[PDB]
Design a protein around this ligand. Structure first.
Ligand SMILES: [K+]
Ligand SMILES: [Mg+2]
Ligand SMILES: [Mg+2]
Ligand SMILES: [Mg+2]
Ligand SMILES: [Mg+2]
Ligand SMILES: [Mg+2]
Ligand SMILES: [Mg+2]
Ligand SMILES: [Mg+2]
Ligand SMILES: [Mg+2]
Ligand SMILES: [Mg+2]
Ligand SMILES: [Mg+2]
Ligand SMILES: [Mg+2]
Ligand SMILES: [Mg+2]
Ligand SMILES: [Mg+2]
Ligand SMILES: [Mg+2]
Ligand SMILES: [Mg+2]
Ligand SMILES: [Mg+2]
Ligand SMILES: [Mg+2]
Ligand SMILES: [Mg+2]
Ligand SMILES: [Mg+2]
Ligand SMILES: [Mg+2]
Ligand SMILES: [Mg+2]
Ligand SMILES: [Mg+2]
Ligand SMILES: [Mg+2]
Ligand SMILES: [Mg+2]
Ligand SMILES: [Mg+2]
Ligand SMILES: [Mg+2]
Ligand SMILES: [Mg+2]
Ligand SMILES: [Mg+2]
Ligand SMILES: [Mg+2]
Ligand SMILES: [Mg+2]
Ligand SMILES: [Mg+2]
Ligand SMILES: [Mg+2]
Ligand SMILES: [Mg+2]
Lengths: 122, 137, 72, 74, 48, 128, 58, 86, 23, 97
RNA sequence: AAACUCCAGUUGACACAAAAUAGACUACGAAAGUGGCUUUAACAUAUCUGAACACACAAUAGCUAAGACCCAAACUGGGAUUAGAUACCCCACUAUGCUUAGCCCUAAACCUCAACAGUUAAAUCAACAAAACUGCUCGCCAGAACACUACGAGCCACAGCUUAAAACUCAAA
């Protein structure tokens, strides 16, 4: 079904980052995925230090990859992202828009529990 | 401006100064208040040791070390050796919930040092090593 | 009661007015009660639309000098 | 306690008796000991308030039933 | 209705043709998922 | 197994789906769906092969066919996960429940019982 | 707001395992706990330490 | 070890009043439950014992919050006797 | 309830295990 | 008979059911600014529903979203993001008093 | 006191271990169990009850074979306490707790409160505990101790488990 790849890339120059995004997308297409949209949330300092491929990363660029792939394509893509040295962190999750939020009527007050003990005169 | 209890961010620009030194350049006074002993070490911003003191190095041994007055004695001594190297303002990073958690900080104040920030860095594992078994007291 | 729906709508749109209730008087008629009486009379004409009937009832009290300050 | 003053005055005006104070135990069931061997118990008890100050049934309500004394209670 | 809606969306998707151009477009544009909530339920947008 | 190019059960009857782009057809196929949606087509295939009225979902034949599809999934699920104890009990209860359904169907409608066994490849055995 | 007590205790109606196992019935008493006296602590230790420090020096 | 330092659980001392800052830091740790967490982590609490302690605290919280509500509810009756002598 | 019944089985089981271990 | 007898109805004065501040709004693990509004500014501890005031459904959503963001490099764990320290205050908690 | 001093404090690198806060939530699973994150598969039955001759599971501890080493820790060693201390306190360390495969089949496996369908009326009801009952079915129980035992039988179990007596004894338990 529809997935979302929370992709955090190493802070590099424009030609290097652009090559990395294309290379990552081609990996999905090589595994039967149908890429929907490529989003750019910007680049900000990582909340905590991340070590990957014997490299210490303090900053990284944020990107989101939306694609349609079979269930078996999810496992293969995770293995691919680990071997990529330019990817700080890559996680594959369900697209939050696929899930439909059920309408909420509100908040029902909870009455105090009653008849928890016998009415005998202790 | 109104005082803010939150420390200034090193990346951001702040107008707060202490003797011409910014918050990131203030030497740090780490305090390790264990249940039986208190170890105080003062280091500068570049992780350069400046002064170190403890109850065991200030005429207290065995159960006497695990007392507030013993920690206070170490705090005064730690301030004295730090003050020789030009330390005036310190940032306190207290670790542990021992009896000398606050008294050791008092020794630094009475020794001629100024406290500008207090930080607690007690190690709390988030699930980690299984601690020792309960005592059958 | 049937008029309780009218009171709920009146308190929702206008709210309690500056006039104070006097429960001592057995024949006391509040602004909300006066609104209900006009609402009942205009209903007997043949109006069956709640929205149209509600607005017309408010206009009648305004023509009679009743102050009707809405919450908005 | 709010209407204790009123009830006592009403009883005096109509020539009847009122007990608006704390009800000592045995005023009805053990009346022959508290007052005397020849005491006469009330032939009718009227409760203007059937609950005590802890929101529980008045003791005299149960006691009057024991002494086969009819009760009129609000 | 959903099939018709979904059919139109594919016309502006990423394929092996619109790969380089779409990558460069992302590197120039930005987005802000982050938003805040008040005590009244009002949504506050980040002004950047 | 149904071909991986087969559309979903919900979208198999929408008009004009034969003239949509091949990209949309791939999305609406079984390839871009989970395993449960595949079982719907598998159950539907038998619901028309065997049941005289495929639209009746409360008949004994529909229940056996629906339960048979679940039993097949557990066998596939336990094939990959040999130490999954939770599904092993579910497999063993579903097998026992199907036999109870087979017993009731055989004792009331024997002619359809032959068709159910033939269609699903079920060899009914009397208990020891 | 008081935590709910619906389904917490093991009862006849409750199908689930109990959430709370109170050693006493959850019924409000007619009395509250008496005020607890503050534990005694050593006082004027700082002043004593300063006074005794000069004695060692003098 | 991998987060930025001098941000978490840091209190700035105002005008050299270290006593107020330390109490503020102590209260923040207590409110977030860090102080109570550290003490119970000194010696391992077995899962059977932890559930018994949690159930006791949860039952304690229910009684404490219910009794507190009644005290506030009846506090308006703490006035003087309006029917003195009756 | 007291554990008097359990204690009797506790001692019987303990002596049985020692007897089994002994012989 | 008598037309003044009470009739059977639902409560017309029944106020609408109260809703949490996040009712009807999506919660996303990438929405760090929203998530940081429900953690302590000094420890990063996730506030309880008695503090945030959220309902049961959104309290679970925020907790799940925070945990996902922390492991995926979107939300700091030990502290609250300083850039979000100036957000509107929606948690009923006071430290300095 | 012993131990350590190849130590401690600050900083950086850095798991086959364990999962703060949320959780004042009360959800899931047949029970046992289940509370870090992601993905896959997936949570039996369109009447109910029903196998202690059946099948599939069953916390922890333990056996078997190959690995992992942080911490905790039977036994053991050292230090102390004590009339003695084969314990409680302190320190060091092993089996073990983890992973893979195969076993073992026990628990206060207890929410000691059977499954389904109902009722809140009468006599509500020994006591206490967690109010009293109806219909139906299955399992189980008939004084205490001997006895979670002997013998027989079955079991990958061999110091084991399951099933389970008798004689003598007591007038109580
Ligand atoms: K955790
Ligand atoms: Mg359940
Ligand atoms: Mg008890
Ligand atoms: Mg108290
Ligand atoms: Mg780490
Ligand atoms: Mg007892
Ligand atoms: Mg014996
Ligand atoms: Mg020594
Ligand atoms: Mg270190
Ligand atoms: Mg683990
Ligand atoms: Mg685990
Ligand atoms: Mg907790
Ligand atoms: Mg998970
Ligand atoms: Mg999962
Ligand atoms: Mg089920
Ligand atoms: Mg059955
Ligand atoms: Mg087992
Ligand atoms: Mg084991
Ligand atoms: Mg052996
Ligand atoms: Mg081994
Ligand atoms: Mg160790
Ligand atoms: Mg050894
Ligand atoms: Mg020894
Ligand atoms: Mg070991
Ligand atoms: Mg259990
Ligand atoms: Mg039992
Ligand atoms: Mg049964
Ligand atoms: Mg029932
Ligand atoms: Mg009784
Ligand atoms: Mg046994
Ligand atoms: Mg035996
Ligand atoms: Mg025999
Ligand atoms: Mg034998
Ligand atoms: Mg058994």
């Amino acid at each position: 079904p529809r997935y979302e790849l929370a992709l955090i890339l190493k802070a590099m120059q424009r030609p290097e980052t652009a090559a990395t995004l294309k290379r990552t997308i081609e990996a999905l297409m090589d595994r039967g995925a149908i890429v929907r949209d490529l989003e750019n949330l910007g680049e900000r300092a990582l909340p905590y230090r991340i070590s990957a491929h014997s490299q210490q990363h303090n900053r990284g660029g944020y990107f989101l990859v939306d694609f349609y792939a079979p269930t078996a394509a999810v496992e293969s893509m995770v293995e691919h992202l680990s071997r990529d040295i330019d990817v700080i962190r890559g996680n594959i999750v369900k697209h939050p828009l696929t899930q439909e939020l059920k309408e909420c009527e509100g908040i029902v007050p909870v009455p105090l529990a009653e008849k928890l003990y016998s009415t005998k005169k202790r | 401006t109104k005082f803010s209890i939150y420390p200034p961010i090193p990346g951001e620009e702040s107008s707060l100064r202490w003797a011409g030194k910014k918050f990131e350049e203030i030497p740090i006074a780490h305090i390790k208040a264990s249940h039986n002993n208190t170890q105080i070490q003062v280091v500068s911003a570049s992780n350069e040791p400046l002064a170190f003191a403890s109850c065991g190095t200030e005429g207290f041994r065995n159960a006497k070390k695990g007392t507030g007055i013993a920690a206070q004695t170490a705090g005064i001594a730690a301030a004295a050796r730090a003050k020789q190297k030009g330390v005036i303002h310190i940032r306190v990073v207290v670790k542990g919930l021992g009896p000398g958690r606050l008294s050791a900080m008092h020794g630094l104040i009475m020794g001629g040092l100024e406290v500008i920030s207090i930080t607690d860095n007690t190690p709390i594992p988030h699930x980690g090593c299984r601690p020792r078994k309960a005592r059958k007291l | 009661y049937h008029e309780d729906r009218i009171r709920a709508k009146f308190y929702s749109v206008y709210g309690s007015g500056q006039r104070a209730f006097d429960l001592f008087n057995p024949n006391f008629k509040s602004t909300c009660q006066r609104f209900v009486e006009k609402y009942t009379e205009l209903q007997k004409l043949g109006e069956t639309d709640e929205e149209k009937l509600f607005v017309e009832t408010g206009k009648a009290l305004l023509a009679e000098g009743v102050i009707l300050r809405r919450v908005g | 306690r709010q209407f204790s003053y009123l009830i006592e005055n009403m009883a005096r005006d109509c020539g009847e008796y009122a007990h608006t104070r704390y009800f000592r135990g045995g005023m009805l069931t053990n009346a022959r000991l508290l007052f005397g061997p020849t005491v006469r118990l009330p032939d009718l008890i009227i409760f203007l308030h059937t609950l005590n100050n802890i929101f529980e049934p008045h003791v005299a309500v149960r006691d009057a039933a024991k002494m086969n004394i009819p009760t009129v209670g609000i | 209705r959903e099939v018709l809606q979904l059919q139109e969306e594919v016309k502006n998707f990423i394929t092996r043709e619109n790969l380089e151009a779409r990558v460069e477009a992302a590197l120039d544009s930005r987005k802000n998922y982050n938003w805040a909530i008040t005590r009244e339920g009002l949504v506050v947008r980040p002004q950047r | 197994d149904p071909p991986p190019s087969t559309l979903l059960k919900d979208y198999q009857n929408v008009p004009g789906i034969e003239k949509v782009d091949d990209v949309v057809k791939r999305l609406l196929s079984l390839e871009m769906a989970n395993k449960k949606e595949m079982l719907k087509i598998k159950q539907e295939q038998f619901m028309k092969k065997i049941v005289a009225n495929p639209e009746d979902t409360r008949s004994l034949e529909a229940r056996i066919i629906a339960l048979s599809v679940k039993i097949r999934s557990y066998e596939e699920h336990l094939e990959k996960h040999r130490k999954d104890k939770a599904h092993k009990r579910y497999l063993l209860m579903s097998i026992d429940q199907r036999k109870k359904m087979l017993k009731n169907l055989r004792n009331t409608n024997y002619d359809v019982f032959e068709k159910i066994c033939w269609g699903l490849g079920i060899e009914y055995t009397f208990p020891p | 707001a008081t935590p709910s007590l619906r389904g917490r205790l093991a009862r006849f109606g409750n199908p689930r395992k109990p959430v709370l196992k109170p050693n006493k019935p959850l019924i409000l008493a007619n009395r509250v706990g008496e005020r607890r006296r503050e534990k005694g602590e050593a006082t004027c230790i700082t002043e004593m330490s300063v006074m005794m420090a000069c004695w060692k020096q003098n | 070890a991998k987060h930025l330092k001098f941000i978490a659980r840091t209190v700035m001392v105002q005008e050299g009043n270290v006593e107020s800052a330390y109490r503020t830091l102590n209260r923040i740790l207590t409110m977030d439950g860090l102080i109570e967490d550290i003490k119970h982590r000194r010696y391992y609490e077995k899962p059977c014992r932890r559930r018994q302690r949690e159930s006791y605290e949860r039952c304690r919280r229910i009684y404490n919050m219910e009794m507190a509500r009644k005290i506030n509810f009846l506090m308006r009756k703490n006035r003087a006797d309006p029917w003195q002598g009756c | 309830k007291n554990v008097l019944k359990i204690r009797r089985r506790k001692m019987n089981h303990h002596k049985y295990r020692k007897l089994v271990k002994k012989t | 008979s008598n037309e003044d007898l009470p009739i059977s109805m639902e409560n017309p004065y029944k106020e609408p059911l109260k809703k949490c501040i996040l009712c009807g709004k999506h919660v996303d693990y990438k929405n760090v600014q929203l998530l940081s509004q429900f953690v302590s500014p000094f420890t990063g501890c996730i506030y309880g529903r008695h503090i945030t005031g959220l309902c049961g459904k959104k309290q679970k959503e925020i907790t799940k979203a925070i945990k996902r963001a922390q492991i995926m490099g979107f939300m700091p764990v030990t502290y609250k993001d300083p850039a979000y320290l100036k957000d509107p205050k929606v948690c009923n908690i006071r430290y300095r008093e």
